[PDB]
């Protein structure tokens, strides 16, 4: 997160860290046994870390649980990044500092303010990965402007959020994390052109378009 602020210990209880020997992506706990993240975060040997604040030191509130299954959207396209969503089943249920986030009943509108969180790079530019979780309030942008920023790359399953001036944005290490608007999970950190660049806001997976797929998938696995 570039241009954000320190969230505060366990103030984003649904935020999880995907660990494969080191933090590589974020995710959101949507059920005591299920986490939603981005499809491009798919990796074998994932360990999910819940109740984290400082990802570098054990502070007592953590729960490290291995993934038993990782289900990437059947229509995920690695070239276009369309349908960049994945569900991770925990090997055992998490003990609910650790809480799940609700799925949206409907899509959010341009202008809606949302909370984006993660342990990604905090420099536009340079490199500086934080110890503690960072937060950022950013507005959902109109489909029109999103499409103007990324010609022929925005699908109906993606939305832009952030500031056209630049300076506040998601960045490497934030992928898969939550965009919560409100109290509802509306987006998943996905991609962008660099980080915090002027006229280049971050692009997120539009969660409201996958709610039925999510519910049925969780239920039959």
């Amino acid at each position: 997160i570039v241009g954000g602020y320190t969230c505060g210990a366990n103030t984003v209880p649904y935020q999880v860290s995907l660990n494969s020997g080191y933090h590589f992506c974020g995710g959101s706990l949507i059920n005591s046994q299920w986490v939603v993240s981005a499809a491009h975060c798919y990796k074998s040997g994932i360990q999910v870390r819940l109740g984290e604040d400082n990802i570098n030191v054990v502070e007592g509130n953590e729960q490290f649980i291995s993934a038993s299954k990782s289900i990437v959207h059947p229509s995920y396209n690695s070239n276009t990044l369309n349908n960049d969503i994945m569900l991770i089943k925990l090997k055992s249920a998490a003990s609910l500092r650790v809480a799940s986030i609700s799925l949206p009943t409907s899509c959010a509108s341009a202008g809606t303010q949302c909370l984006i969180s993660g342990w990604g790079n905090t420099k536009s530019s340079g490199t500086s990965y934080p110890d503690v979780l960072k937060c950022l309030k950013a507005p959902i942008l109109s489909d029109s402007s999103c499409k103007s920023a990324y010609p022929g790359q925005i699908t109906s399953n993606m939305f832009c959020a952030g500031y056209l001036e630049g300076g506040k944005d998601s960045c490497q290490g934030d992928s898969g994390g939550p965009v919560v608007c409100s109290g509802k999970l509306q987006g998943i950190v996905s991609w962008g052109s660099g980080c915090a660049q002027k006229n280049k806001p971050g692009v997120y997976t539009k969660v409201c378009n996958y709610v039925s797929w999510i519910k049925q998938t969780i239920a039959s696995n």
Partner: protein
Amino acid sequence: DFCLEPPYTGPCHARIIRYFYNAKAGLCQTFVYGGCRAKRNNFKSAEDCLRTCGGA
């Protein structure tokens, strides 16, 4: 020669550690890959990197 190409992080925001052949140094080094749209000078291990690009 894709082995002489600089490492490509790509547009996605993950922080995945991969290897690329660094022709100047004559060795495989680590870099942050974003998770999508990888170019060919991007390996999951130093061994794979050395086998494919070593001495290029």
